[PDB]
Design a protein around this ligand. Structure first.
Ligand code: MG
Ligand code: MG
Ligand code: MG
Ligand code: MG
Ligand code: MG
Ligand code: MG
Ligand code: MG
Ligand code: MG
Ligand code: MG
Ligand code: MG
Ligand code: MG
Ligand code: MG
Ligand code: MG
Ligand code: MG
Ligand code: MG
Ligand code: MG
Ligand code: MG
Ligand code: MG
Lengths: 114, 155, 59
RNA sequence: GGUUCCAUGGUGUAGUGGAUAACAUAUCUCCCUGUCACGGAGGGGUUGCGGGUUCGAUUCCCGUUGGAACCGCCA
RNA sequence: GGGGAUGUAGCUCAACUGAUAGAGCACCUGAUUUGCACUCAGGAGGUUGAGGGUUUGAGACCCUUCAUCUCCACCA
RNA sequence: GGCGAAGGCGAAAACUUAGGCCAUUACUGACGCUUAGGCUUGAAAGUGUGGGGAGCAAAUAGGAUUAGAUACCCUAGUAGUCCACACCGUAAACGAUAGAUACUAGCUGUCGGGGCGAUCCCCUCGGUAGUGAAGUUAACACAUUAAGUAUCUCGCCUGGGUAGUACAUUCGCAAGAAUGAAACUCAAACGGAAUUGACGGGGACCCGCACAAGUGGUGGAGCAUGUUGCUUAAUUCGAC
RNA sequence: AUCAGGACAUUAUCAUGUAGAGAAUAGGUAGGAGCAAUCGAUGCAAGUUCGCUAGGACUUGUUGAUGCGAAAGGUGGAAUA
């Protein structure tokens, strides 16, 4: 019922999440590899990110929006498969801003696995 | 480690219906190195097909074999545990060859009588997409569709 | 890191966004695992030397 | 001196309200490897003694051994 | 004693207030392993407790029994 | 790349404050180098008292893996990591190279002051790097910032294991620090550098029925033959 | 004392609504067997009803002089003014 809005696409190294939201807060719908039915290790594969983007794009397109600002997030591997999925869905991508949290040397990160 | 691609021997046009593919399936059902025996068996099945389906045997054979032909092939690739499979497009030559091998393999296991009627029933049962070779093709296709994610990584 | 699409084409936006994300991914991965201060300085000097030596022969 | 518990394969333990005995380790044969350990397949091996009841006792009953756990106080 | 429940496959439980006999795990075969498992495909396994009636039809709706589960009172 | 003697120092500002480089027609007029003893500082961990605690994580609990896992992986998680005041005084505290002084080819960078005046670039005086001959070294290599030619002063070394152990002593609340042997034992040493091979669950490249793609088999049954074991008077001997 | 909210009762509100078969959403009974016409035909447009996504009834707009085989015709357990 709204023309413009925001779709946050977080890409963790282990999973991915695509949240379609109002231009300010108030998410309208959300989807993830887990809710699709994919389980375990497969949830971290670029193909799954594209699949998740496709379902949320179809759902949100029937709701009737055109202009999308795409706030890319995370540091996974399928960060662009979802991007191409939305473009092939045909929504009007207006911005490609990236907002992955970067620290300015605050908080000590965890130990190195070996 | 070879760097050379093997040559290919001629396939030969069939001597009756002039459909190369007949010679290939003859060689597939070959056992004990009997060319004679295999031709007789196979040719007898087309005659049974005439008596039953009232249609041209070559057309029925193509409709059965062409329907059985698969599209995706799953190649095993182990890394650490088990194998993650990889769907790849099989060439045209191997497509017919794999189809013929399955046709013969499920034909020599049917509950029917003399392999003439055995092999005759399998081909007629495969022209209507309801048989044993069909199920094998269905299973590999579904397995490839399930393992669509790893298709991008081959080696 | 906002980049406008310009609404003239789509690829170009992703052609610029690829660069921006790579330099972005570098610092994002740096603040993921804890190294000592000496090792952190060690890794900084290592990156600088690699970039320097590559630029010498590209200049 | 008295009272309660236990005795099952080579070793550690389950069951059976009478008709039936398994688990693990161990043992044997075969894959496995240069070989061996580990691994895989298959194979095998059982009611403390006695005496009664029942058509039938490892099980139910009374005695006899061995090993434990409890008590043996008031002067 | 009084009320409320249940009985559907080998093991648990859905159904659906009347028109499907199902889901899951156990058992079996196939793909797949160094194995052990996880995964993926297929398959079976039922007087729907018994008895009577409803309805054009039932496992279901109702009535009555059998069995177990709960409860919820108790000066011989 | 800069600064400090070393440890160390990187958001911004104020106050206090240390040393250093260049030019000196100025001044004192050998007042200089080193330093046993002594004093000061000294990463992180650790200690005592009082605050603080977001994140992380020794110890600890659980889930995995595994023949076993008190470990590598994951989920939690206290002391601690932080501040103030008191201690501890050890590190691969390394340029594995004590400080000071004079001399000895050159080339390429870079930083600061000074001279010229768009930068850029040239010269002078210094700091920090790379390459490089004489020279030195067992070799690797050092080479004007020496491990070169020489002098002064201090510290330290005298085969390996015992052993940085034991006793005594000083310091410390504590863990400990400093100092530091011997009996006994070996002919060498987890000695140094370099060379030829082998090997690597190190890379790069190339081959073969090796894998892959197929076909027909073997391991299951009966039989033939050979072998192991056992037996027997002998089951002749060898091949493993 | 007042306000707001949903509990559960309603004053009062009538479409709903989906065996097959039947042409049909069949909610059960229309008493029955033709009936409605400014007590206004018929027409198609918009929304809504709920869904058994086929269909349903209702409202709004066109709106004017014959519609109503849901009277009579239909099959069915259930039925046609
Ligand atoms: Mg981590
Ligand atoms: Mg063998
Ligand atoms: Mg006493
Ligand atoms: Mg500290
Ligand atoms: Mg533990
Ligand atoms: Mg954690
Ligand atoms: Mg502590
Ligand atoms: Mg020292
Ligand atoms: Mg040199
Ligand atoms: Mg000595
Ligand atoms: Mg000493
Ligand atoms: Mg030693
Ligand atoms: Mg060597
Ligand atoms: Mg092969
Ligand atoms: Mg054999
Ligand atoms: Mg055998
Ligand atoms: Mg011999
Ligand atoms: Mg010999």
């Amino acid at each position: 019922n709204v023309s413009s809005g925001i779709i946050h696409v977080s890409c963790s190294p282990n999973n991915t999440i695509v949240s379609a939201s109002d231009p300010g807060g108030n998410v309208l719908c959300w989807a993830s590899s887990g809710t699709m039915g994919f389980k375990g290790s497969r949830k971290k594969t670029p193909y799954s990110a594209g699949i998740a983007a496709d379902k949320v794009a179809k759902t949100v397109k029937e709701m009737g929006m055109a202009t999308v600002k795409l706030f890319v997030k995370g540091t996974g591997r399928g960060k662009d498969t979802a991007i191409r999925s939305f473009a092939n869905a045909g929504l009007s991508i207006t911005e490609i801003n990236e907002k992955t949290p970067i620290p300015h040397n605050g908080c000590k990160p965890p130990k190195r696995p070996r | 480690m070879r760097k050379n691609r093997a040559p290919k021997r001629t396939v030969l046009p069939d001597p009756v219906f002039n459909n190369t593919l007949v010679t290939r399936i003859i060689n597939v059902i070959m056992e004990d190195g009997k060319k004679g025996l295999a031709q007789r068996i196979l040719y007898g099945a087309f005659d049974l097909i005439e008596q039953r389906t009232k249609e041209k045997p070559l057309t029925v054979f193509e409709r059965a074999v062409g329907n059985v032909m698969p599209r995706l092939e799953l190649r095993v690739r182990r890394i650490a545990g088990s194998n993650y499979q990889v769907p790849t497009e099989v060439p045209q030559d191997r497509k017919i060859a794999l189809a013929l091998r399955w046709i013969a393999m499920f034909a020599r296991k049917r509950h029917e009588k003399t392999m003439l009627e055995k092999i005759a029933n399998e081909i007629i049962d495969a022209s209507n997409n309801t048989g044993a070779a069909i199920k094998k093709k269905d299973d590999t296709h579904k397995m490839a569709e399930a393992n669509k994610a790893f298709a991008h990584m081959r080696w | 890191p906002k980049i406008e699409v310009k609404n003239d084409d789509l690829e170009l936006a992703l052609k610029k966004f690829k660069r921006v994300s790579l330099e972005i991914r570098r610092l994002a991965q740096r603040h993921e695992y804890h190294l000592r201060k000496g090792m952190r300085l060690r890794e900084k000097r290592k990156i600088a030397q690699k970039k320097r030596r590559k630029f010498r022969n590209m200049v």
